[PDB]
């Protein structure tokens, strides 16, 4: 009785975006506690990736909120474990996060294209409002970090950027 | 001299959306004073529908504001009286309002589709920004009310939800 | 079971004074946004007639609350559109509103005479408290406005009085 | 070089209590948004189970911080989806959570017994400080909730207890 | 490594929008100091066009910010001098600014159409969010000024609107 | 359905602990009001033992809250009148309290050894957290008062230590 | 007469622990003022190790207070001069500190075991509360310091970590 102009493949897409967000929350959680391991001991990346872990959880809840708003049905799936147990250098992890956000960005743009093909005017604006530009700004930020992590180099530079920039 | 990329059927659509909003303001006004009748005596729905009556008036003024912004001409028509003189149970009225907002939602989505076909980029975003998601959230809210009004049932439950939720 | 000394004919007059108030509100809303149109562009008039639209909408709602309080039943009719689509000069519009308020005063006086004949002291005093003096002042204000608008003439004076007096 | 009196089997129990906590968090997130669905529409339950989702997610992270502090290595597994897609009545859901917390208490007690057998006083006291009493209270709270939900019955009472007690 | 779904003709369009904004900043700067010439001595238009000069500079920087966000390359060109060295009456200059903003509005709508044809979902929303409605409201405002500058007429009227409205 | 890892013996032992703190509370009240008697008239000792009476009462209430929290059943017994109807000198009653608290301490340690023997890890930590260390601080306090009340002697010593240290 | 459940060997062990905690403060005091030597001139390390020395002297007084509370007897031995008059680099001193903390941790765990095997439930919990988890926190912290000291390297890095992290 509330569902209106809400295509069933869109509802499917929304249910798949939820898992991808939760999967990205779990990767940043792994990364965050990787930098908390004594042998890595980078507390600034810890802080930086715990916050990314929190925010990607919020994104998943926004989609579940969205799924209920439009009259859809939320269906959850296993949250896959992250592709690695350790994440290398600070620069390595940022690199791995850039690739994660680009992949999430394509799913969001495909989800938008799908919704657009089915005439879902509110769903498109909704994805634009809550996701399309945050993704762009998240990706620009990781790129910047990577350039800067290259410039400062390993060793003291890595300590510094971790402390004075991340967190 | 200001009109730019503003199709004349769009201007017509905007003029018809104005009347539909004013017609919905008038229905919620009828509903609001129906609950003020001693034989109904639901002061919380009174408050809830007076506020919906005010907000649907504001929507109509936003469109008139919009009509003048884009270079169009506002043409007003008779505001039809509401389809009923009394509105039944609290649950009945919410049900009648859900159906009103769904109908308004389709007109807004058709108005958007029309504007889109004529390339009106600003008009589309404008409808999305001011209407498409407020409609979605208004519809989700009425649905929720209806589920809750079913759960509490008639009698004391109806008194309670009126007092402790509506207004 | 609350109706007392409330005559059926008085109930009908209230019902029709309600529709009359909604109609003056619609007329002022029309004038308000006529002055928002770029080809007119008198911002003060726009604010002046928009708040007059809000006020005669509140008159209608008082009459509606009164109808209920005394134990009548509200019956709404269509609100006919305004007279005109455009309202000419600032002075033409104030003169048009004067005529409107003037007609509105007469049916209030008619409603008062009707109630007196039915021995309805409370309805008579209610009408004097909320309407009869507040119309006398509105009519005096408009007469003042017309004179002043006549004094300052067209062009620079119309802008001046619109900016410095209305709103 | 910081590991001390930390047994490999205890490290494995922590790793699996981590995954267990993430799993209870996912289950509660599932219940939280089941109550946000319009066909259910219990706002209090939604806030109650969303904050319980946040909490058992923090349990997982404590265990993660502990694993690192004592010199183990974190190993994450997939978080299996919840049991069910819908959770029935408010009382069904609290009973389901009771069973869940109940299972979670047992493996904490198992983890405690395991650690005791390895002579691991610090890990035992850590588990008592952060988990063992905080589970006893959670289980008592849920038992209380079930009784109360049993007392107020279906319909108006479920709404009442959802509004006035959960959240 | 950050560029994603960012068409190279879009990047070209963005680089051309930058120059058009800077060109409009420079015209309003000329206009602003024209009204500062003793022989014109309109200090309110001075203030009004210095602020428009500042804001059109900001628009150009938003696009450069945009160009770097999406992974593009900023390429600057000569900022052409304004089409006139003097700008006539206050009404003449506003008229010249209306025509400037309408031209800028078409470039923005063409830039949007281009981006839309290449599927750039984020770029479209971005142009809508930062430009499409500010343009509409800037154009409605200049039109209004022009109507009012006609009404007040030359001489004292021109002094007044300059002082009491512009700035 | 909330009971877990809570042995039937422990529960019996909690019930008699309940009775033994209530017995202590009442012994301490009798002491307190003995020192309020005009023939004794030590206002410090009255305050001191009325306070300890309240604390042992709170202990008994903590123990009843724990019985409920772990899923047992409170079973109350008669509260036996205290050992004496009068308590001699100030040092005498402090000495009776030391004996009493050592009896309560040894009961708590047996209740702990019982609970340990059944693997009730939460019970053990609860007794450590609220009882075992408070008993040892109390006993040190009592031993300290006796040494001092020995050092100050009878007469003006007793009076002084009553007024300046106890209460 | 206050000694209850306090074994002869538990007491000898607190006395040995008092001396051990006194030995740590002396070593850390020695570390502290080495980093104050002109040929060393690390002010962070001095601040940081002066604090370590204070803390370990707090720990010694806690045990001295415990021995008195349980009715044992404090017996003091000489406080041996530290192993080294000089401590090398910052990372060398921190590594020495991690070794002493693991040693001190072991005899605490040893002391905890001795008391367990005598059934001293209070003494065990007392060591958990004031010592075992503090030791794990200190050992983890020291670890992190060695990893970061390796990462920042010699020279500027050693200076940087000393200023920006230690004190």
Author numbering:
A (entry chain C), B (entry chain C), C (entry chain D), D (entry chain D), E (entry chain C), F (entry chain H), ...: 3 to 169
Paper quotes:
Canonical ferritin is composed of 24 subunits, which self-assemble into a quasi-spherical nanocage with an outer diameter of ~12 nm and an interior diameter of ~8 nm. Thereafter, we introduced a self-assembling strategy by designing π–π stacking interactions at the shared protein interfaces involved in two different kinds of 3D protein nanocage superlattices, which is referred to as key protein interface redesign (KPIR).
Subsequently, Pro156 was replaced with His, termed P156HAfFer. As expected, the introduced histidine residues formed two pairs of π–π interactions between two neighboring P156HAfFer molecules. Although such electrostatic attraction is also involved in the formation of the SC superlattices, the designed His-involved π–π interactions play a dominant role because wild-type AfFer cannot assemble into such SC superlattices. Although the adjacent P156HAfFer cages are not aligned along the C4 rotation axes perfectly, the dislocation angles and distances are almost negligible relative to the entire cage-like structure of ferritin, and thus, they do not affect the overall SC structure.
